[PDB]
Structures are given as structure tokens and as C-alpha cells.
């Protein structure tokens, strides 16, 4: 049956033109692609695993589109936040994310990135308690994480290191996926209290009593006041070798830094891009705080880089670092959406019809995207480009023998007359 696909997308358009909000179209496009992603994936010829991934990718694209256009377009402007110098850093961070839409967009994108991150299954047969092997062998004169750092790592049993590896890797995957609560649960329950505690430093300080404008979200002060310190402390910890590469990786991510080579070598376009947007973000916040004298000089223990990249440049670098992946045609759209250069790319792939015909999803996707765009933002895509796109896709509806559902797509030109 699967050669139903176009129906689903077409179907969604029917429902829209007929209850005469348009963001639902895309939401459905997403779900549609995802549903199809499942079909080709389950039981299939290994020629299908490929086009299955091109559907999952499809789906992620629609999601990213929804998220960003919702934020950008459903922008109806709220009330400005008036801080005082007595206010906590927490509030200033919030203010920053409110006022600077360019940067919040980065947040949105990171959220999307996390959403679609793979995490291993929870490690089984985890041991009763930490470093149990070393303790049992005798030779841990101190039971604290820093003991084998104070003096040769030869202290820790091999099996203990192997388990610390399992743990820190799992925690790392969870952190990259946004699963911070799960990471704290794992830390707690796996007898890694001190690491847990480390994960608690992630929050900026708020006090509901002082920072009135969040006395709703909070009933109790929380987060840590000397955060610039925390951050250097963690970063330095991240640079100290004789720690497991995933642990160092974790601290890197937390300090707004770029994890060690041993770990980073396995990160893909999404993972890598995520890492570097995290860096942009971290740097930008800490700079925002410095420009408002909410950082205390004592805490500038160490040099961290102060110069934030632009999303443009991060993308360019990550691209050159992952050319194969970068060049994949829906991930180009992903980037195009991220930079807003989107009608830009529409008109572009339009002129590539004048090695876009070779891949099937593309001509469809661009067309339905163009439709959505001009629905949500009348004017968005050049009238001509709509004409050209629908023209060509329609002729494929003909080549597929689905003339049945051509009128729906017609509802965008007087050129429709000619059908």
C-alpha cells in the first residue's frame, strides 16, 4: 500500500482549506512523515532502511519548522522585565532569554537537537555501591572521587574503572539528550552522590523572595550564587586527565566548552552542532552577566573564551567537519530554516529545475513547505516559485496516477484554470 504517502500530505491540506492554526498543517506533516518512517523501518528490504531514515529526517525537519515558525510568527509581544542590581543572576539570565530573540532561537534549536538524540539503554547489573572492588581489595585510604587523583590512578581496580566508564558514558548520553532529571536520578541511585551534586551546579541562583517576578515558579531559593566560579571549577576539572573521557566530556559540556577528542570524534552533525550552539549560548550568557556587573571579580579564576560564534559560522564549521551529512538535502533545509534563509533556498531548488529530480522526497517537501509558508506568511514565497513547484509536483501526481487529489493543490493560482 505504502505508495499512499502523497494522500496523507494531500489529506492534511484538504482538512485545512475546508474548516473555513495553519501550524497544524506542518504538525501533521511531521506526524505523517513519522508514521511513514515507522512503516519502511519495521519489516523491510534493506533498501528500505535508507528511505526510512530519509523519512525520520523528513519528520525532524517538519518539527524544527513548527518550533521555529511558531516562535517567530506567533510572536505577539509581551511585557518587558524590569530588573534591579540587587536581583539574582537567575533573573538576568531569564531577562536575556526574553529580550534577545536571536539567542532564544538558539535555545529552541538546541531543544530540538536534544529531542532527537539517541540514548543507550539503562545499564543493567549495576553494582550495589561505588568503587566496591577497590574497597574490597583494600587500598582506598579515602573513599572520595578525588583520592586517585591525589595520587596515582593505580589505586583504582580495573573493574571499577570499567564501571565508572559505563556510568559516565550513560550520564553523558543523557545530558546530551536533555535528560537532566534522569541523570540526577541515575547519579543518586547508582551511589554517585558527588557527581549528582556536580550536576546540581547547573542552575543559576534565584530567590523567590528577592526575585519577586518568579515567586510563582519557586517557593524556595535555589541554584548557586558563585556560578562563574562553579563554571571555572568544572572546566578545570574537565581539563584534568586521569579522569574517564566521558566524565571530562560531561564537565566540558557543563562549562560551555568542547569535549575532548576521544569523545568528540564520535559526534555527528547534530551532536557536534549541538555542542557548539551550547558553547555560543554559555558564552553569550556569561557576557550578558559581565555587561551588567552581576559577576564578581574573585570568581574569574581562569580564562574561558569570551567571543561567541554566530550561528552562521558554527553551521559553516560543523558543515566542513561533516561534509557528507551536511550536504544531505533535507539537512540543508534544516540549516536553511535555522538561518531563516528559507524562501532563499526554495527559489534556489526551484532553479535546480531549469540532481533534485533524482531524490523523491525533495520535490514534494519543498512544495508542501512553500504552501505552508505562504499560508502562514502570505507573500513568503514568490508567486512564480509556487506556480513552478506545484506544476512539477502535480505532473508527478499524474505519473503516479493520483489525479483524484489534484484540485486541492490547484487552490493557489488562477493558473489552475489550465487544468
Amino acid at each position: 500500500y505504502q505508495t499512499e504517502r502523497f494522500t496523507k500530505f494531500s489529506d492534511t491540506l484538504k482538512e485545512f482549506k475546508i474548516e473555513q492554526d495553519p501550524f497544524n498543517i506542518i504538525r501533521e506533516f511531521r506526524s505523517a512523515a513519522g508514521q511513514l518512517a515507522l512503516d519502511l523501518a519495521n519489516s523491510g528490504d534493506e533498501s528500505n532502511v535508507i528511505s526510512s531514515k530519509d523519512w525520520e529526517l523528513e519528520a525532524r525537519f517538519w518539527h524544527l519548522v513548527e518550533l521555529l515558525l511558531v516562535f517567530r510568527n506567533a510572536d505577539l509581544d509581551l511585557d518587558e522585565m524590569e530588573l534591579h542590581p540587587y536581583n539574582s543572576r537567575g533573573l538576568f539570565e531569564k531577562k536575556l532569554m526574553q529580550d534577545n530573540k536571536q539567542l532564544y532561537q538558539i535555545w529552541i534549536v538546541m531543544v530540538w537537537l536534544k529531542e532527537n538524540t539517541y540514548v543507550m539503554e539503562r545499564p543493567k547489573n549495576v553494582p550495589t555501591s561505588k568503587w566496591l572492588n577497590s574497597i574490597t581489595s583494600g587500598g582506598l585510604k579515602s573513599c572520595d572521587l578525588d583520592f586517585p587523583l591525589r595520587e596515582n590512578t593505580n589505586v583504582l581496580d580495573v573493574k571499577d574503572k570499567e564501571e565508572d566508564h559505563i556510568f559516565f558514558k550513560y550520564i553523558y548520553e543523557l545530558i546530551l539528550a536533555g535528560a537532566i532529571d534522569e541523570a540526577l536520578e541515575e547519579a543518586k541511585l547508582s551511589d554517585n552522590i558527588s557527581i549528582c551534586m556536580i550536576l546540581c551546579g547547573i542552575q543559576e541562583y534565584l530567590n523567590p523572595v528577592i526575585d519577586t517576578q518568579i515567586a510563582n515558579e519557586f517557593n524556595t531559593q535555589q541554584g548557586i550564587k558563585k556560578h562563574s566560579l562553579w563554571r571555572r571549577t568544572v572546566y578545570s576539572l574537565s581539563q584534568q586527565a586521569g579522569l574517564d573521557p566521558y566524565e571530562r566530556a560531561i564537565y566540558s559540556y557543563l562549562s560551555g566548552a568542547i569535549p575532548n577528542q576521544e569523545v568528540l570524534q564520535y559526534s555527528d552533525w547534530e551532536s557536534d552542532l549541538h555542542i557548539h550552539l551550547n558553547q555560543i549560548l554559555q558564552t553569550e550568557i556569561e557576557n550578558y552577566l559581565l555587561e551588567n556587573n552581576q559577576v564578581g571579580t574573585d570568581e574569574l579564576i581562569l580564562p574561558l573564551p569570551s567571543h561567541a560564534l554566530t550561528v552562521q559560522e558554527v553551521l559553516n564549521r560543523v558543515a566542513s567537519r561533516h561534509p557528507s551529512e551536511s550536504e544531505h538535502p533535507i539537512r540543508v533545509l534544516m540549516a536553511s530554516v535555522i538561518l531563516d534563509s528559507l524562501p532563499s533556498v526554495i527559489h534556489s531548488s526551484v532553479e535546480m529545475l531549469l540532481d533534485i529530480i533524482d531524490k523523491p522526497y525533495l520535490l514534494r517537501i519543498v512544495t508542501h513547505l512553500a504552501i505552508c509558508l505562504d499560508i502562514i506568511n502570505p507573500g513568503s514565497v514568490e508567486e512564480v516559485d509556487k506556480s513552478k513547484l506545484i506544476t512539477t509536483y502535480i505532473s508527478l501526481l499524474k505519473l503516479q496516477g493520483l489525479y483524484e487529489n489534484i484540485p486541492i493543490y490547484a487552490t493557489f493560482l488562477n493558473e489552475s484554470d489550465c487544468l
Binding site: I135, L145, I193, S194, I198, C200, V209, W230, Q240
Partner: protein, 163 residues
Amino acid sequence: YMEKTSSDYNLWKLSSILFDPVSYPYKTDNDQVKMALLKKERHCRLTSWIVSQIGPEIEEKIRNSSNEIEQIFLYLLLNDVVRASKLAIESKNGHLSVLISYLGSNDPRIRDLAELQLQKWSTGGCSIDKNISKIYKLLSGSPFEGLFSLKELESEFSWLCLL
């Protein structure tokens, strides 16, 4: 009218810190907030002052220590979280270092976790360094009130230092 060096001056000053009203010049959304700020201010001045007093005692003690983790603890005795964190970092005690950064945020999660770690050690725990346990006990939020208690430090430190 008194010398800033005289013990008398100390009496009158400490008395000012604890009893004279504080003023908080910046306007506050509601008044219970104000009250909270006034409490933080007073607390900060009292604790800066105590650190003024115990200062040389502890600096002497740091002069004579032969063990890095003990020094880290003493820096916590001067309410200097940052230099404890730094020495930890330097003496290659990095995890501790991170933990240290919590001292003075009153995060009850961290509190109950630190205490938990302490019970687990104090039930088997073949051996834990004498000063790491002290530091954890500080993170527990109840350093004498306790079951790994710093009360015995009664004999090694000015009562003011422990307070």
C-alpha cells in the same frame, strides 16, 4: 571614639552588627522580601566580621599544615570557598573542588546527599580521609549537630571559629 585595634572596639562593633538596625536602600516589591534581604545583609556582615577575627588563627594553622586536603578545609574555615576550590583543583582534588562550590548555597538536596554519603561510609566504609569527611560534614549542613561530628574540633579551634 575608640581605637579600631582595641577589644572594646570589637565588642561595640559586633554589638552594632547584631543589634543596630540595618537599612536597605533599594526599593522592594513587597515587605517580606525586604525582611529577607535585611537578614541576608546582616548575616553577611556578621560572617565577614567573624572571618576578620579568626583570620590569623587559621592562617597560622594553614602555615603549619603538611597535608593539602586539610588546607582546603582550613580555607573553608575562613569562609573562602573559592581558594578551597582552587587548591582542590591544584592538588588534583577536582571532584571535591566541584562539591566545595556548593558551600553557602543551602541546597537541601546536596545536604541530604552529603549526609547519606557519610552514613554509608560510617557503616563499613573501610577508610575515608580524615579531612574529606570533615568537608562532607560541612556540606551536610549540621557539622556538630551530627553523626560524624566536628564537635571534637572544640579542642583545636576558637569557639568563634566553629560558630
